[PDB]
């Protein structure tokens, strides 16, 4: 815990990755209960990254 | 129409709640003409019901109930 607001460890980063992973799975479950909602969830989701995000979808 | 009632219910009003709703209609105005604008119905209602959470112990509520109706 010596480096606060400094060079952080990657074990910390890894733990963050699990946190990332865990939230992600929650969403997987969430969509699983209500898959129809994605699009509307997405419109808000697109509120960010959107031009690039259009690029991959348009690719698709 | 929510304007028009809210023009017609300037009274009977908790101004706090009014300031909330009138803000966020204002931000219906800000987010309109987006492809993705919806009314935050559940938010305003639930908030109001925070103030049901606070008022409801009292039966003081027949003007208020019928405005919240």
Give the minimum alpha-carbon distance from B61 to chain A in angstroms, rounded to a whole number.
37
Give the minimum alpha-carbon distance from A34 to chain B in angstroms, rounded to a whole number.
18
Say how many CB pairs under 8 Å bridge A and B.
5
Query: Which residues, at least 6 apart from B14, have a Cβ–Cβ distance to it below 8 Å?
Result: B51
Experimental method: cryo-EM
**CB neighbours of residue B14 within 10 Å:** 14
Strand-pair partners of B32: B34
Instruction: Give the C-alpha separation, A24 to A26, whole Å.
Output: 5
Q: Please spell the DSSP secondary structure of B1-69, one letter per residue.
A: -HHHHHHHTSSS--HHHHHHHHHHHHHHHHHBTBTT----HHHHHHHHHHHHHHHTTSS--HHHHHH--
Q: Do B35 and A47 touch (CB under 8 A)?
A: no
C-alpha neighbours within 13 Å on the C-beta side of residue B22 = 14
Q: Please spell the DSSP secondary structure of chain A, one letter per residue.
A: ---SSS---HHHHHHHHHHHHHHHHHHHHHHHH-GGGHHHHHHHHTTTTHHHHHHHHHH-
Mutate to test the interface with B, among A39, A42, A43 (most CBs of B within 10 A): A43
Q: Do A44 and B35 touch (CB under 8 A)?
A: no
Query: Which residues, at least 6 apart from B15, have a Cβ–Cβ distance to it below 8 Å?
Result: none
């Amino acid at each position: 815990l010596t480096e606060e607001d400094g060079v952080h460890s990657v074990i910390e980063e890894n733990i963050k990755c699990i946190s990332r992973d865990y939230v992600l799975k929650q969403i997987r479950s969430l969509v699983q209960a209500n898959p129809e909602v994605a699009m509307d969830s997405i419109i808000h989701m697109t509120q960010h990254i959107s031009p690039t995000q259009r690029a991959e979808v348009i690719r698709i | 129409e929510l304007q028009d009632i809210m023009t017609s219910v300037s009274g009977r009003i908790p101004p706090n709640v009014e300031k909330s709703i009138k803000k966020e209609m204002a931000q219906y105005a800000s987010n309109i003409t987006s492809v993705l604008c919806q009314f935050p119905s559940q938010q305003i209602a639930n908030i109001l019901d925070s103030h049901a959470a606070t008022l409801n112990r009292k039966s003081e509520r027949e003007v208020f109930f019928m405005n919240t109706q």
